[PDB]
Design a protein around this ligand. Structure first.
Ligand SMILES: NC(=O)c1ccc[n+]([C@@H]2O[C@H](COP(=O)([O-])OP(=O)(O)OC[C@H]3O[C@@H](n4cnc5c(N)ncnc54)[C@H](O)[C@@H]3O)[C@@H](O)[C@H]2O)c1
Ligand SMILES: NC(=O)c1ccc[n+]([C@@H]2O[C@H](COP(=O)([O-])OP(=O)(O)OC[C@H]3O[C@@H](n4cnc5c(N)ncnc54)[C@H](O)[C@@H]3O)[C@@H](O)[C@H]2O)c1
Ligand SMILES: NC(=O)c1ccc[n+]([C@@H]2O[C@H](COP(=O)([O-])OP(=O)(O)OC[C@H]3O[C@@H](n4cnc5c(N)ncnc54)[C@H](O)[C@@H]3O)[C@@H](O)[C@H]2O)c1
Ligand SMILES: NC(=O)c1ccc[n+]([C@@H]2O[C@H](COP(=O)([O-])OP(=O)(O)OC[C@H]3O[C@@H](n4cnc5c(N)ncnc54)[C@H](O)[C@@H]3O)[C@@H](O)[C@H]2O)c1
Ligand SMILES: Cc1cc(N)n(Cc2nnc(Nc3ccn(Cc4c(F)cccc4Cl)n3)s2)n1
Ligand SMILES: Cc1cc(N)n(Cc2nnc(Nc3ccn(Cc4c(F)cccc4Cl)n3)s2)n1
Ligand SMILES: Cc1cc(N)n(Cc2nnc(Nc3ccn(Cc4c(F)cccc4Cl)n3)s2)n1
Ligand SMILES: Cc1cc(N)n(Cc2nnc(Nc3ccn(Cc4c(F)cccc4Cl)n3)s2)n1
Lengths: 268, 268, 268, 268
């Protein structure tokens, strides 16, 4: 049967059909999973997109910055999957950093209010989500988050790299808490993916240099990667999240699995 | 419709039914894989152990230190799986370090001839095996090897830790070579497993202190592991090797997946 | 004759004579450096403590959360060292995490407002300080910050570990900026030291079950440390900051130097 | 006075006036150290080179592969520095990998006899040297070895990268032993240095493709390094070894100090 056959999985972070979460949800559904989806702000738009998934799935509003949304989350999920049922998987595919903190603006010019908003959404919310959903998770369960290797500095990513460094630390502590429930907590450090936003930067939305920068990053990534890297294909990343959601990585927690073509293991 | 259905996989390193390779072979077979097994010396003695696996599998002699064994290996594998057939997976579960380099003997007292024998078997042979089998491997294939996290020094493991540090480097270069074939190369860094040598030291073979050191390591490993660690259970390790042998980790190469209960991510 | 002879160095973070910055200031002064000191809140207590240093040094108010304090900082430093003079070194020995995010309070119960305050002071302010002081720094100069190894999760440190993970990332980006000035940026990852909040008999934000855990950390640190760890001696840490402030580590930037007795390199 | 004033230091690995050890020996002597030098094979030539150092220093024969040379080493050093005197420092600047294991030959084609020779000289000998000299070292002493970051694979370096991975592991264990003597053990991970052999490759000794590979590595290194990288200047590397030989890094052992311009901390 499917790799996630009979598993109830919550998938957050679908905004467009280019979203890494859209591919995670598609592959999970193809693999037998029953999903609950969470969306933020543009809920009629998210619903129009989630309608294109292989199967029907409840859509729940979740702004990770809203305390009431988090407090009611477990209650709202239980109502959607049915009383007496628990989640076997949670996918955090949420990330945000204002333009002041990521892009063409100098590193020193990012106001802390902006950096703090980005760290809240990109790092702290991994713990928020785990706090809310662990009480309605089954033993053997899995929490997966999305990472972009922050171990070395790079142009443009700036405070998003700082936020991913914090996310990596948050994951290690979430694992400590999750373990009390028999639940694993891990990250998928993916190589660059051509989402709508990335296609817009490459296209010059923020100028020729920011575009050239992303194309240069992508070129070197495919070059270093012993098996190559196709930024236009999120399926290898989606498959890796599903591997972690499955029972096939049962002794891995507080960790990072690199779905990057093996680029991080090569210098040149 | 198991995880490795229709896959032809070579599994090296079975000596007892406690061997990590025995559990890898058992889980792979349970998951629909057609296996070729390689054994070191015994063969007749090894065959009686492989006979206890869920299904029949050809047993081939392979001493990684013997040049003729490696030269003839691909030819012998092809004969066993049938002309026109190729391997989809290779499992290197081979390791050895003489008592002089691993145990109660001081680190400075290990003669280089002994360290060299251990490095040959435990590290260099990962490249030797890849060299021999990559020409008879299919695109999308996977080479998996066994590691014991050498990133920090520890008592007793001494030169076996040094050998694993070399193994980790070898795997990153093997990935470069394997990529030319569409093949991934990765290591499963396992927590301590009660195999032949481990059960011997615990049992008192190198005295009361040495046995006590291993029991203390194991206690602390389970303590650190947010999901715990059972050194008497190789199934979580075997399942992880199968995840890497599958098509569910398609963008991971030259890497290390930690099947250690998440112990390496926790300080205390 | 001294290691920092003729060097003008700014030292932040003195509150008591137990403060790592007090020892950095003392060793730097012993080594020929001319200092400018920055203090926060209790500027009367700070002045009396700084009066105990081997030599006189101007004391300037600096709350890293106050925008005006940062905007006026370079101007105020220049006034103290004399027009036409620039800093050769900058020491960031600033850290803070509320009791909700560091201690016995559950990890999930730390409100983001508290975590954000801690990340602002402990991580973001390293960039804030570099932004303010780099325009008044000389080529060959050095920015040093204080880190506590966050690569593995641990009890009690909780969100302070998350903040140090962010600090490490901030340092790599600050190095990029500093390099444009011929200035190096590095962190000193110290072993635990009994400073104001760490205090067990007189003062301290550490009490009851948390105090028990920090005692287990202490003993563990010294056991792991091949050269031992004295939590009551900040001199080895102070000497390491001075090594980075000197011209003896001229090719090291965006890095971490561990003054921890070597504990981080040992498993057991 | 000098950074190594009154310190008795053994310096190995001088073969040409371009050798990293020649610069280490020159800077150490400039900084007040009294040295003992060890040379291999071409001792009349080594003497001619070492005659160009700022001060006279005894030259001792030491082939790290010769057991008698190691057994007699401490005795021979004591005779040179005078009875009752001990070394305060030891510099291991020894490295070798045959052309089959480093260069233009395929990674899989390196015979183990060649790899074993290279690992013996480049990694194992760090432990051999420490075994021999620790009994004649003073508390507070320092053992320093030379490294080239092997954490990521790269073209051409092949089995030398594998040997450096082993060296890094050896260092962590040597630290455990050294600590019993109050002696620190660390490695200096240097960026590429234009030694005679490097100038020969760049110049086309192993063909145009190999030259271009080295030139490309060096170009990328200077690019990533926030403070740049001059492969033609060994002084920043020599100064870093001296910082470790001094009393200014007293809490650092079993570690790696990167004298690489900060390159290893930057992706691009
Ligand atoms: N695209 C890449 O190259 C890449 C690489 C590695 C990791 N990632 C990470 O993958 C994740 C998904 O990003 P993506 O590339 O699919 O882009 P995306 O824009 O499709 O996804 C990010 C999601 O975060 C959601 N979000 C933002 N603020 C929120 C809030 N307050 N509450 C709830 N949801 C909120 C958005 O609605 C969106 O659905 C992010 O964590 C991102 O950092 C992306
Ligand atoms: N047991 C643990 O705690 C642990 C932890 C991490 C990694 N590992 C690694 O897992 C692997 C398997 O070891 P194990 O623990 O299952 O024990 P094991 O004793 O059952 O297996 C090691 C195997 O190596 C084989 N071997 C030795 N020399 C050989 C040679 N010259 N040619 C061919 N084969 C040779 C032996 O025949 C044996 O089957 C090793 O690489 C080991 O280092 C073990
Ligand atoms: N003590 C340890 O075990 C240890 C270990 C590793 C790193 N460190 C780090 O060393 C540094 C120095 O801390 P310490 O241990 O000497 O203790 P400390 O309490 O004496 O020093 C922390 C300093 O931060 C200052 N500070 C707090 N909020 C501030 C603000 N808003 N603006 C400006 N200054 C502010 C305080 O006034 C104080 O001087 C910190 O960054 C700490 O995280 C400490
Ligand atoms: N040049 C670089 O790009 C670079 C970068 C990082 C590290 N390193 C390392 O720095 C060290 C110094 O090498 P270098 O580049 O200055 O070149 P080098 O050739 O001048 O020095 C290497 C030394 O090893 C000695 N040696 C070889 N076999 C020996 C044996 N059996 N016994 C004793 N000595 C022996 C040689 O005589 C020579 O003095 C080596 O460890 C090298 O790996 C070099
Ligand atoms: C790790 C990662 C990668 C991506 N795309 N995400 C999701 C995002 N979350 N917040 C973002 N905000 C911003 C501010 C500016 N940009 C555009 C831009 C850039 F300037 C430089 C590089 C890439 C991009 Cl897309 N995106 S992007 N997370
Ligand atoms: C990482 C790992 C674990 C196991 N079982 N292997 C396979 C081996 N290959 N050669 C070995 N040789 C020897 C010599 C002595 N011992 C026993 C011992 C010890 F003294 C100290 C620590 C642990 C052990 Cl098991 N094992 S163990 N590799
Ligand atoms: C890495 C480090 C060490 C120290 N002293 N600092 C500076 C600080 N800044 N704010 C702090 N605030 C707090 C809240 C509670 N405590 C006490 C406590 C604990 F409960 C558990 C562990 C350690 C400690 Cl110290 N300190 S500590 N940074
Ligand atoms: C880490 C490091 C760098 C250097 N030069 N050393 C010292 C050496 N020890 N043995 C060496 N042997 C060999 C075999 C072939 N080459 C030439 C060559 C190459 F093919 C590829 C790259 C660089 C060079 Cl120089 N050097 S070089 N250690």
């Amino acid at each position: 049967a499917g790799l996630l056959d009979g598993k109830r999985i919550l998938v957050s972070g679908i905004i467009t059909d280019s979203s890494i979460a859209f591919h995670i949800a598609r592959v999970a559904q193809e693999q037998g999973a029953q999903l609950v989806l969470t969306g933020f702000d543009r809920l009629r738009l998210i619903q129009r997109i989630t309608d294109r998934l292989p199967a029907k799935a409840p859509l729940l509003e979740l702004d990770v910055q809203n305390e009431e949304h988090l407090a009611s989350l477990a209650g709202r999920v239980t109502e959607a999957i049915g009383a007496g049922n628990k989640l076997d998987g949670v996918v955090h595919s949420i990330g945000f950093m204002p333009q002041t903190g990521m892009g063409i603006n100098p590193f020193f010019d990012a106001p802390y209010a902006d950096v703090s908003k980005g760290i809240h959404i990109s790092a702290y919310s991994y713990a928020s989500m785990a706090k809310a959903l662990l009480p309605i998770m089954n033993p053997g369960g899995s929490i997966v988050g999305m990472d972009f290797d922050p171990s070395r500095a790079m142009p443009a990513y700036n405070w998003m790299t700082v936020a991913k460094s914090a996310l990596e630390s948050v994951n290690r502590f979430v694992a400590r808490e999750a373990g009390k429930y028999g639940v694993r907590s891990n990250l998928v450090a993916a190589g660059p993916i051509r989402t709508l936003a990335m296609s817009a930067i490459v296209g010059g939305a923020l100028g020729e240099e920011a575009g050239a920068q992303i194309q240069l990053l992508e070129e070197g990534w495919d070059q270093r990667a012993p098996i190559g890297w196709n930024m236009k294909d999120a399926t290898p990343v989606a498959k890796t999240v599903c591997a972690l959601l499955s029972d096939w990585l049962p002794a891995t927690t507080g960790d990072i699995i690199y779905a990057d073509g093996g680029a991080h293991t090569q210098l040149l």
